[PDB]
Design brief:
part of a larger assembly, 4 chains, A mainly alpha, B mainly beta, C mainly alpha, A: 1 helix, B: mainly beta, 6-stranded antiparallel beta barrel, 40% strand, proton-transporting ATP synthase activity, rotational mechanism (chain C), hydrogen ion transport (chain C)
């Protein structure tokens, strides 16, 4: 009971970390694929 | 009476086994999921498959052969057709690649 | 910088959606070329822009390495002789830090000009030093 | 630390990391060197260079006086890696990683 509890509490910690990592990887991929366009402002007016 | 290919752009970037193409201005353009030939030499070509068509006009290419020969700035020709491979009873007893090369 | 009124009026319009000789896919290097083409079309002269690019290319050959990241077109004397449309565009790029696209916006502009003037350019790829004979 | 010349200004500060925008002319900074951010006219905070971007922006890891660091402050370059006192004159003392007693 003390050996299967540790593996259950170690598993929940790893599961939370991996799922969060996956989401952030997708977030960074969709951020990287995005590109900023030409800025259409009155640059001279400054 | 010339073997006129269909040039669609140049090779911009190479990352391992995949590449990106920039289309030359005012060219026919390539179709999705088609095969293209990267002119690694005036007589030698490397096969690639179209995977992405981006808003910028850039094209994602999956390289299939002669990867080491691919360099940035090389010309690209578009066959305009999907992938076709030899099929028949004449292939039995042989070892082939996915492209049909024995 | 004091841009001319005509360029100021054009810059605020939706010129990107106007008609052009060719339907090139939108891109960062294409927006500037369209702006130059639209500005030049009003005056009717397009060779001025080509001369400006030629001067830019000649000047860049003497500028220090990576001049496009410390660039100040206003302070550069070589660009002082450029036409108002080209100079405005260069300042436009410098503001966005895209002066490295100078050699590609020119290619698009030439393509538009050739299409408008009904000229077809054939590229003859030849070995280094083998350009002597092009009869075939 | 001996300063040589200004190499830009502080732009962004995210906790213990920071970014520097180049000074006019982009003098340049050697990678992995130590830089001195002029938090005060007489006080300079220590930073470690870890990234040289294409645009000219430098990535800095702040070491001390992180709270004092503010955007817009000048940055000077030592031009050398981190060197610390060593020898028998340091025995029996308590120091920090920068060599300060």
């Amino acid at each position: 009971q003390q050996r299967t509890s540790s593996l259950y509490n170690k598993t929940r910690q790893f599961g939370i970390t991996a799922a969060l990592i996956e989401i952030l990887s997708a977030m960074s991929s969709l951020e990287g694929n995005a590109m900023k366009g030409v800025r259409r402002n009155k640059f001279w007016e400054g | 009476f010339f073997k006129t290919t269909e040039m669609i752009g140049y090779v911009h970037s190479i990352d391992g086994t995949i590449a990106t193409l920039i289309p030359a201005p005012g060219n026919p353009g390539v179709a999705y999921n088609t095969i293209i030939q990267i002119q690694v030499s005036p007589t030698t070509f490397a096969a690639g498959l179209v995977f992405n068509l981006e808003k910028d006009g850039r094209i994602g290419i999956i390289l299939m052969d002669n990867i080491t020969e691919v360099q940035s700035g090389q010309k690209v020709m578009a066959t305009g057709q999907l992938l076709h491979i030899p099929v028949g009873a004449g292939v039995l007893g042989k070892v082939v690649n996915p492209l049909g090369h024995e | 910088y004091t841009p001319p009124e005509g360029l100021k009026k054009l810059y605020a319009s939706d010129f990107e959606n106007s008609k052009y000789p060719l339907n090139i896919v939108p891109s960062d290097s294409v927006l500037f070329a369209k702006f130059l083409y639209k500005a030049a079309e009003e005056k009717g002269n397009f060779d001025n822009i080509l001369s400006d690019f030629q001067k830019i290319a000649a000047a860049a050959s003497k500028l220090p390495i990576f001049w496009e990241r410390t660039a100040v077109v206003e302070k550069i004397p070589e660009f002082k002789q450029l036409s108002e449309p080209t100079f405005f565009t260069l300042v436009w790029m410098q503001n966005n830090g895209m002066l490295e696209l100078i050699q590609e916006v020119a290619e698009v502009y030439e393509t538009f000009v050739n299409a408008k003037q009904k000229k077809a350019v054939a590229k003859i790829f030849v070995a280094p030093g083998g350009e002597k004979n092009v009869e075939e």
